[PDB]
Symmetry: D2
Subunit: 237 residues, 4 copies
Amino acid sequence: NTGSLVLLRHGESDWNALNLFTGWVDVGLTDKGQAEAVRSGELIAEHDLLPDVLYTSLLRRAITTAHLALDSADRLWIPVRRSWRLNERHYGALQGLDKAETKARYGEEQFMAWRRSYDTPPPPIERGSQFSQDADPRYADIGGGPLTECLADVVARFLPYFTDVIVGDLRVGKTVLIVAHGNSLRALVKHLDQMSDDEIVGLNIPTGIPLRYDLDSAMRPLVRGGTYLDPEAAAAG
Amino acid sequence: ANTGSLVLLRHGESDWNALNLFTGWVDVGLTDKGQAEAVRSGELIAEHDLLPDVLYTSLLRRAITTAHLALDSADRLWIPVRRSWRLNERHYGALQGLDKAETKARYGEEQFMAWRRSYDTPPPPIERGSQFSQDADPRYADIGGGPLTECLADVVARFLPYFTDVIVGDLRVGKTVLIVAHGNSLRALVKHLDQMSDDEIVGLNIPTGIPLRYDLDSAMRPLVRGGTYLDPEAAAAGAAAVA
Amino acid sequence: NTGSLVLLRHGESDWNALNLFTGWVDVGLTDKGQAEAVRSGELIAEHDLLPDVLYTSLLRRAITTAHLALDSADRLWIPVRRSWRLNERHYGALQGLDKAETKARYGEEQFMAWRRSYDTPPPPIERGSQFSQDADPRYADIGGGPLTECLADVVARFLPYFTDVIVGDLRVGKTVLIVAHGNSLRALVKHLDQMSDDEIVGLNIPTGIPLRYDLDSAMRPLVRGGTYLDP
Amino acid sequence: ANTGSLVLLRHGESDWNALNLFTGWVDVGLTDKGQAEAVRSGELIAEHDLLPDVLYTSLLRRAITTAHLALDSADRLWIPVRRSWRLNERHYGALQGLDKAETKARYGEEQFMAWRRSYDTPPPPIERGSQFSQDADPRYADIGGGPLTECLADVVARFLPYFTDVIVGDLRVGKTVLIVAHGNSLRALVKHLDQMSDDEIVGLNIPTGIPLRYDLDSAMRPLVRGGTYLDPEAAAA
């Protein structure tokens, strides 16, 4: 068997609650976000999808979600690997700004572009500014990381991790759990279902509902778009 | 590189500590108070700028969650982690799941203290397949389901290969290593670091919640015999508090 | 402090002897190529630079070079990791061709652009052809791999391996040996010395002579262009 | 077809084998005869459709070079490799660097035989810092220089941890594993797999340069006790 691949997007963070652009800013989960993660773990267990290995980003809202999920699934003991390549998109100079206030100041057109352009990133964040990560030691091996990203950049930096590290696990039949972010999971779905640049821009992935991919020998999905474990909950839009 | 700092951390109160039951490999959770201890452990590591570069744990949720909580308060959640059965608590054999007092009453003082601490005599073997046995748990599949009981000598034998072949090389290249584990496995490590006698380690008590820093030389010999607790006062009192 | 980085480009292959474009074709070293690897090892040992870890490509001419070098340096026992990201540039449909046939097939203008461009790859090789690698199981996790590459493509797929794996070793003080290929090492030098797209394409890297890069905390060369270990 | 195949290979003639010297951890190389054995072993592997997915060796060049030549012939040079002292030949203590005559001279005939086939009695410890001692070799730093002598019981004891915690996991996910090592370390492994007595394993011969195949069940139990050589006709010679 090619192993099952389970994707999970973390739930509500503190900055989600404040309605701020977060990006690589390392904020925590709200109480609700923590409760969602626990249920995530129940769903996984309820559908007989116990992971053999866990992949996360370097961001605590994904790492804690993963912890809580595995705790509820009774699989805390399994191996885990973490990579910046699973991080959320870097939001550049938007990091720390209010979304509502931003939409107003620049309008819906610039807003939507910033949020949803595939090829065009926001302005670069200022090095060593309050909400920049360029001085964080976790990014020293990449020279502090990018100053901004668009989804096309996420795709480019995510995919090497997937092919070089995770695919190997699936190939030998392991069930893989990936806990990460809207943009990095959108990047992976774009690759798995071989989606176009404009098709991927309309893709929404809901929080806290595990998404199961059943792959073939070629790492090709058996079911395009995968299968959510709670379709009606997924279905909130 | 100059040799990395080694940090040892014993988890706090579990649900079975609270019910006074022998635990061993039974995979019980933490009490609210054991969780609070772990958060505090993290603060101490940070206030003493001992930020870890890598984490090692057992396969037991009370250590794993202790680790998560400490790294979160130390803001080092993102570091790599490795887990191994070789860091597990001593297996308590047929004592797993039984009340310590009730067991003391029935078997006697001397037998009770021999089981808990006798360096070379383990408790009686657990029944394969029984309610508090781990022998059929997949996580121990590659070791044939594991031992049915253990003495400290047993823990020392199965713990050290992991220390020398995995953790030491981290220390050698200068990484700050955090090990979050259990009473007997950490006592097994301390026995080895400080080259303690069988007789001496039986008396050693390691307090919960308080990180212990070892400063090692190039040959992995401690520069401070017995290491240094980040809260030496608490340490002395936790060393008492035990059980 | 930061570890030393030692770079080694393998010596003569069987196809170099016939002047054939090789790319990912997995051809072996000539006997001269082998002897050059042995000497490479002697030079490393002669300069007291004993590696703590080895990185190679998936191609036998580098793998064997590394084996012979480490043998002669008496550091055979060290950990080794291999990656397609360290492979030679894929030469697309030129793989297996000599110049003549290539200028014949593709004209002199493209022969030139394909030789000196940074951003123009050769034509894609045909899938399942005799000198294609798309069916090799070693490339299964990347869907068989690319069917052609320009230097820019090599830079793009090389650097993730360098930052995410090799720089970590360097940061904790290890001496790192990389045994690879003209263009993969060219890509690395581009990064280390921050060279321009225009300047990198004709950068020369001699075979069989180790190249030592002393770096600072910031992974920046103390010496621009490194130091060749040689008489 | 889920539990992977195990392929064991004992290197051929070393330069000290030619001088009839006790070698142990002394890191001598392969004779011309020895290399040819290696190359032929690789052809045998390929001829039997046994492509390795991963390679395990000792830290001793006679093994590592054997592995390289074998994989070269099988055209699997590119596969991942892991090396460990736990696959090393038995340490021969004070006998390292001695011939039979000089051994019988300073130690006597009575224990020469003892140290020959006693499961449990190691030769004398070698002098630390002496000419054929490895105690100061940096590759054994993490284990304090290593033991100063071994008996086969010792070898069994330090081998098995590596088998259960590293190699079995590969087998479990279906990989074909190639182990290239030495007489006493492969003996340790076969004693385990076929549950050989202490006294049984003393007279077990493993021929040099003939790959030994073990097919295993989920319990890591051989399907065929003793396994299957790839050149049966040559089993002893």
